[PDB]
Amino acid sequence: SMEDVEETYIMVKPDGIQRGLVGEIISRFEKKGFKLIGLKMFQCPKELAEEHYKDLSAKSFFPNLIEYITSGPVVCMAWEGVGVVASARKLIGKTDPLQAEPGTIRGDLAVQTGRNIVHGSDSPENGKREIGLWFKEGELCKWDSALATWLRE
Amino acid sequence: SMEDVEETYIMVKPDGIQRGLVGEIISRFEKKGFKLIGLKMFQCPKELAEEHYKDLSAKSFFPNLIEYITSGPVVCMAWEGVGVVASARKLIGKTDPLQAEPGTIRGDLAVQTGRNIVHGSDSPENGKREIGLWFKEGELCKWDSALATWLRE
Amino acid sequence: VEETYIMVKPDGIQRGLVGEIISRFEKKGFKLIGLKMFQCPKELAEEHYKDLSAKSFFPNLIEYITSGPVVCMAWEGVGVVASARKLIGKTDPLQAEPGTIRGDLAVQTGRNIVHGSDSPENGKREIGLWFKEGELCKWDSALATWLRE
Amino acid sequence: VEETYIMVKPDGIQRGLVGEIISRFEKKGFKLIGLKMFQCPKELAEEHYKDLSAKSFFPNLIEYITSGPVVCMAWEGVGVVASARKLIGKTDPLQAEPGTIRGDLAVQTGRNIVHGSDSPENGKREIGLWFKEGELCKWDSALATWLRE
Amino acid sequence: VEETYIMVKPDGIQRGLVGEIISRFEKKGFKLIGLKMFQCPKELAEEHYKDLSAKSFFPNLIEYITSGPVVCMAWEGVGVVASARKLIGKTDPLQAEPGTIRGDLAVQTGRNIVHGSDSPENGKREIGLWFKEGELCKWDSALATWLRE
Amino acid sequence: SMEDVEETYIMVKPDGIQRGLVGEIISRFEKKGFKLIGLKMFQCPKELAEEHYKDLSAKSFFPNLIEYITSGPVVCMAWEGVGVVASARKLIGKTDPLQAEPGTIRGDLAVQTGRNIVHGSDSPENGKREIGLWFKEGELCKWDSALATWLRE
Ligand SMILES: Nc1nc2c(ncn2[C@H]2C[C@H](O)[C@@H](COP(=O)(O)OP(=O)(O)OP(=O)(O)O)O2)c(=O)[nH]1
Ligand SMILES: Nc1nc2c(ncn2[C@H]2C[C@H](O)[C@@H](COP(=O)(O)OP(=O)(O)O)O2)c(=O)[nH]1
């Protein structure tokens, strides 16, 4: 089968780190069958995070948002796969954890919106933008999976 | 508008114990991020069980509910958190396990309405009712969660 | 009592999800009455996919389920047929909801790791097709009363 | 039948390990007969640790054991005391072996998340010190015939 | 390549441990080449436990092994026989260390949920006794290069 | 509590990645209670892998080793904690996954020495060394665990 493998940026937030969910979140996607090509614990500089949420820079929560997202280290992840962006969004769950369906990362492991543990790109366009914003040039590591023949047709 | 801290009475029904599921159910709620302020293996006295199911006292099966809930030990739990009530019902799943969705407790662990493992208050008003009903005035334990600031803003 | 047929496909084995899938049905509360690693011969696979014989993918499908061993299973319980389907998830893993088998453990339709009868009729058919006279095992669950009224 | 006293300490609750610890003993096969989240008043704690009153760490200990609610437990089964001591692991989480509770989930003796009666006589003493009578519950385990002969 | 016979005793099935026990061997890295739920006949139960024939617990043993269906398994991998022994843990569940199957999920010797050949030749001998000719399925793991050099 | 906190270098070898065990491994230490201060997927250059295994350079397996450790990305890690070095090694198991006791990382998830899915510093000094060899000045993230007070005195 031929079908482009998109990339999506997935980020475990400060709270996710504090609660020790870094291993758990990663394990969810590893079991799903997606490839990890970019990974790193990272203390996000204020500028980068402000660039990341550039679109929300006018909002009244923006200050508080940047404050939190930089208040502690986060984990930067880049996942490759076919239809992985939307898939990631599904596995993550609704923005509001209380409304997230059990089985999803937020519905299983979080309770409040302002602390929803993780971020998934909302589109392949943003997946590219974010992976290029949070990751330096040669940080990504591409590799052929040994299970490639058993993950995809 | 911001919602107040809430309390709910979650109960592991007789079958939950027989199948050694007390631990996993407590875990699902500990993992979600709520705070356990009430817990005890309890032998529900007939009078207490009667008050618990008072809204069904007119039902022809009312006897079964009382009889059954008194047939063996149960685990009483009192959980706290903003929106914990509506959330607990969500992690628990539809009454008929066969219909509860994969990911919910009943959805992943049960097969018949009658032996649907756990119970959670159906409303914030009923949560306070059941907690005060099942727990003796000194059985509730209040404490400050060290992860409070990472669970909610 | 209702019985359904559930099978882990070659990719489920390769990826080592046999124990996982089984555990999920055990925990749910259904009784396992049939189990066996089996290398499916072409003709039997074709028989299994009888109705898709005119389809375009048919051959690929036949290769896929014979490209490695499978693990046949016979599960019993009231309404197990539909429940099993719900636990397996949508045919397309990307579409199946998190919490289901394909929703958590697969990424593509052509390799969606598991199978479940879609009807009580096919349940008997498929079980009667993959299991031989006597390979099934009956037993009384000690937790029977704590699983059903 | 033999019963032992197991208690999840304050750090255990603070770290959301109650469910996990209970599950281990459940999955092991012993029967739970007593359970409760309890706020240990200083005197009960000092009586439990009666023998250490003279030691310099006494103050710290009492503060710690009462710094938050604990979860009291009572389990039943032949050899449950020693086994529970084995499942829990050496006093020092760093020396505790991988597979044991403290070994898998803790990092320091002063925060070694759980307790377990070190002998059957102590099991009775502690269950009697931490529980009130009506608190223990007796019941018949459906799976007994499959747990023992 | 060395093979060993692993089997889930009847107490394992009644307690829903089939999937969990297989997973321990899938996660370890070993290859499943034999599997089937089987109702063990008294005669076959006797040949297997020939060495314990003159033991006083023998009779109870034979009735136990025949008390319900069991799950027969064959795993491949160099050193598997010895590795399975460890994963299984000491005969008396109460003495098997945490981390092992008997140490985490059993409480008495007469209901130790699992079996494993104690040597390579007993593995060969046991697979020939529990599995018929083609019930074994030969296949190669796509992860071969990452499990052994 | 005046106890000295050391750091240890823990790395997920190429096979760990191939086998989707990155998460599981991370969760073992996360749940143990140690702190993650360094983490990154990385494709190791022969030169770096040799200066890392210089003490085995004369061995007959060295050549293969070097190629194995560089045959694909690995996941570098820096863990902090009192006695984390010795603990981490205990948590990993014997060099031979067939000997490693069940419950340890290698005894639970591997079947052969040359593919023992993970590495951990064998001493506090090699701890400092390896972290310095694999992590650049500034890749390590310092932070305060909200549970620090419940993990230690
Ligand atoms: N009912 C009963 N069974 C016993 C007693 N001692 C031993 N057995 C059973 C369970 C033991 O695993 C078996 C003797 O087993 P072996 O030491 O020959 O081998 P093994 O360690 O592989 O365990 P297995 O065949 O899996 O049950 O017979 C006893 O006192 N009472
Ligand atoms: N490919 C290959 N690698 C080997 C062989 N023997 C040892 N090694 C490698 C992997 C071992 O982890 C490493 C030696 O490690 P060690 O100093 O005994 O301690 P450890 O940090 O591995 O626990 O050398 C071997 O026989 N073949």
Best CA proximity match to E108, nearest among D1, D5, D144, D4: D144
Instruction: Tell me if D107 sits within 8 A of F152, measured CB to CB.
Output: yes
- Taking an 8 Å cut-off on Cβ atoms, the answer to whether D147 and E10 are in contact is no
As for ligand 2, residues whose beta carbon falls within 6 Å of it are: E 149; F 56, 61, 64-65, 68, 95, 113-114, 116, 119, 122
DSSP states of D39-66: ---HHHHHHHTGGGTTSTTHHHHHHHHT
E113 within 8 A of D148, measured Cβ to Cβ: no
Interface contact C111, partner A, CB < 8 A:
yes
* Residue D28: closest C-alpha in chain E: E105
Distance between CA atoms of B153 and C121, rounded to whole angstroms? 53
Task: Output the CA torsion sign for D20, D24, D27, D29.
Answer: negative
Is B52 catalytic? The answer is no
Using DSSP, state whether A6 is helix, strand or coil: strand
Closest approach of chain F CAs to the CA of A96, in angstroms?
Answer: 23
User: Which amino acid residue places its CA nearest to atom 17 of ligand 1?
Assistant: E91
Best of C61, C94, C102, C113 to substitute, by most chain A Cβ atoms within 10 angstroms, is: C94
Residue closest to B36 by CA, chosen among D10, D107, D34 = D10
As given in the structure block, the two tokens for residue B116 are: 């649907």
The Cα–Cα gap between E49 and E44 comes to: 9
> Percent helix, strand, coil in chain E (nearest 5)?
45, 15, 35
Å from CA of E109 to ligand 1 middle = 7
Q: Are the CB atoms for D79 and E109 separated by under 8 Å?
A: no
Residue contact E28–F109, C-beta within 8 A: yes
Determine the Cα–Cα distance for residues D98 and F87; give it in Å rounded to an integer: 9
Q: Which of F50, F95, F111, F123 to mutate to test the pocket of ligand 2 (most atoms within 8 A of CB)?
A: F95
Calculate ∠ Cα B41-B46-B48, nearest 5°. Answer: 70
Q: Which helix (H) or strand (E) holds A7?
A: strand A6-12
Where is chain B discontinuous (C–N over 2.5 Å), named by the preceding residue?
none
Rounded Cα distance between B22 and B12, Å, is: 7
β-sheet bridge partners, residue F28: none
The amino acid that residue F109 corresponds to is L
F15: which chain E residues are within 8 Å (Cβ-Cβ)?
A: 146-147
Answer for the pair D3, D76: CB distance below 8 angstroms, yes or no: yes
Residue E51 DSSP symbol: G
Would you call A42 and F141 a contact, using CB atoms and an 8 Å cutoff?
A: yes
- Among candidate residues C113, C129, C111, C133, the one with its CA nearest the CA of residue C48: C129
The string of DSSP letters for A100-129 reads SPBTBHHHHH--BTTB--EEE-SSHHHHHH
Residues 6+ apart with CB under 8 A from B10: B25, B29, B77, B78, B79, B88, B92, B118, B119, B120, B121
- Characterise E2 by phi-psi region: left (phi > 0), alpha (psi -120 to 50), beta (else): beta
Which residues contact residue B138 at a Cβ distance below 8 angstroms, ignoring those fewer than 6 apart? none
Q: Which two tokens stand for residue C135?
A: 């390979």
Q: What is the distance in angstroms between the CA of the first residue and the CA of the last residue of chain F?
A: 5
Q: Among F9, F16, F11, F10, which Cα is nearest to F117's?
A: F16
* Active-site residue (options: C101, C106, C115, C130): C115
Rg (CA), chain D: 15
CA distance to A5, A146, C110, C129, per residue, from C60 (Å) = 22, 21, 9, 21
In whole angstroms, what is the distance from residue A110 CA to residue A114 CA? 10
Experimental approach was X-ray
Does the beta carbon of F1 lie under 8 angstroms from any beta carbon of chain D? Answer: yes
CA distance B10 to B3: 20
Q: Which residue has the tokens 């799943």?
A: B93
**Cα(E42) to centroid(ligand 1), Å:** 16
Residue E99 alpha carbon to ligand 1 centre in Å: 20
CA distance C69 to chain D (A): 31
**How many CB atoms are located within 10 Å of the residue B144 CB?**
8
A and C: number of Cβ contacts within 8 A: 66
What is residue E44's three-state secondary structure? helix
Q: How far apart are CA D84 and CA C128, in angstroms?
A: 47
Q: Does F153 touch chain D (CB under 8 A)?
A: yes
Beta bridge partners of C67: none
Q: Which residues are B119's β-sheet partners?
A: B11
- Cβ pair A80, A35 in contact under 8 A: yes
CA nearest E76: which of E146, E10, E144? Answer: E144
Say if CB A130 and CB A52 are below 8 A apart. Answer: yes
Its sign, for the CA torsion E23, E26, E29, E31, is positive
Record: contact D14-F87, CB cut-off 8 A: no
Cross-strand pairs, A7: A80
Nearest alpha carbon to residue F36 among A22, C27, C21: A22
Closest-CA distance, F101 to chain E, in angstroms, reads 7
Q: Chain C residue with minimal CA distance to D144?
A: C142
Mutate to test the interface with D, among E66, E107, E108, E114 (most CBs of D within 10 A): E107
Whether the CB-CB separation of B37 and B7 falls below 8 Å is answered with: yes
Q: How far apart are CA F125 and CA E146, in angstroms?
A: 30
B7-12 vs B74-80, strand pairing mode: antiparallel
**Contact between chains at F24 and A25 (C-beta distance less than 8 A):** no
Domains recognised in chain F with CATH numbers: 1-153 (3.30.70.141)
Chain-centroid distance of CA A144 in Å reads 22
Helix ranges, chain F (H): 14-18, 22-32, 46-52, 62-69, 84-92, 105-109, 124-134, 148-151
Which chain F residue has its CA at the smallest distance from D12's CA? F150
Ligand 1 touching residue E31 (CB < 6 A): no
Q: Are A145 and A5 in contact (CB under 8 A)?
A: no
Whose atoms come closest to the Cα of D149: which ligand?
1
Torsion of CA D16, D19, D25, D27, to 10 degrees: -130
User: Helix E80-88 crosses helix E18-28 at what angle (to 10 degrees)?
Assistant: 130
Q: Confirm or reject: Cβ of E110 under 6 Å from ligand 1.
A: yes
Catalytic site residue from F76, F119, F127, F134: F119
User: For ligand 1, is residue E61 a contact (CB within 6 Å)?
Assistant: yes
Residue of F26, F32, F76, F142 to mutate for A, most A C-beta atoms under 10 A: F26
Going from the Cα of F62 to the center of ligand 2, the distance in angstroms, rounded, reads 9
Measured distance CA(D55)–CA(D57) in Å, rounded: 6
Report how far residue C86's alpha carbon sits from residue D123's, in angstroms, rounded to the nearest whole number. Answer: 46
Which residues, at least 6 apart from B48, have a Cβ–Cβ distance to it below 8 Å?
Answer: B133, B134
Spacing, Cα F79 to ligand 2 middle (Å): 21
Q: Which residues of D are catalytic?
A: 115
Sheet holding F74-82: strands in order across? Answer: A118-120, A6-12, A74-81, A35-42, F35-42, F74-82, F5-12, F118-120
Pairing of the two strands C3-8 and C70-76: antiparallel
Please state, in angstroms and rounded to a whole number, the distance separating the CA atoms of residues A26 and A8: 14
**How far, in Å, is the centroid of ligand 2 from the Cα of A131?**
36
E119 lines ligand 1 (CB under 6 A): no
Does C146 lie at the interface with D, CB-CB under 8 angstroms?
yes
How many Cβ atoms sit within 10 Å of the Cβ of residue E106? 29
Q: How many CB atoms lie under 10 A from the CB of residue B30?
A: 20
Instruction: Break chain A down into helix, strand, coil percent, rounded to 5.
Output: 45, 20, 35
| Binding-site sequence positions of D for ATP | 9, 57, 85, 91, 102, 112
Using a CB–CB cutoff of 8 Å, tell me whether A2 touches chain E: no
Given a contact cutoff of 8 angstroms between Cβ atoms, the answer to whether B22 and B14 are in contact is: no
- CB-side neighbour CA atoms (13 Å) of F80: 16
**Nearest residue to E59 (alpha-carbon basis) of E40, E46, E41:** E46
- Is residue D90 less than 8 Å (CB to CB) from chain F? no
Q: Give the integer Cα–Cα distance in Å for E105 and E126.
A: 24
The DSSP element (H or E) to which C72 belongs, if any, is strand C70-76
Mutate to test the pocket of ligand 1, among E6, E17, E52 (most ligand atoms within 8 A of CB): E52
Quote the radius of gyration of chain A (alpha carbons, Å).
15
Query: Which neighbouring-strand residues pair with D19?
Result: none
- Distance from the CA of F105 to the center of ligand 2, in angstroms? 15
Q: How far apart are CA C141 and CA C30, in angstroms?
A: 10
Measured between alpha carbons, how far is C17 from C39 in angstroms, rounded to an integer?
17
Among F61, F106, F116, name the best residue to mutate to test ligand 2's pocket (greatest count of ligand atoms within 8 A of Cβ): F61
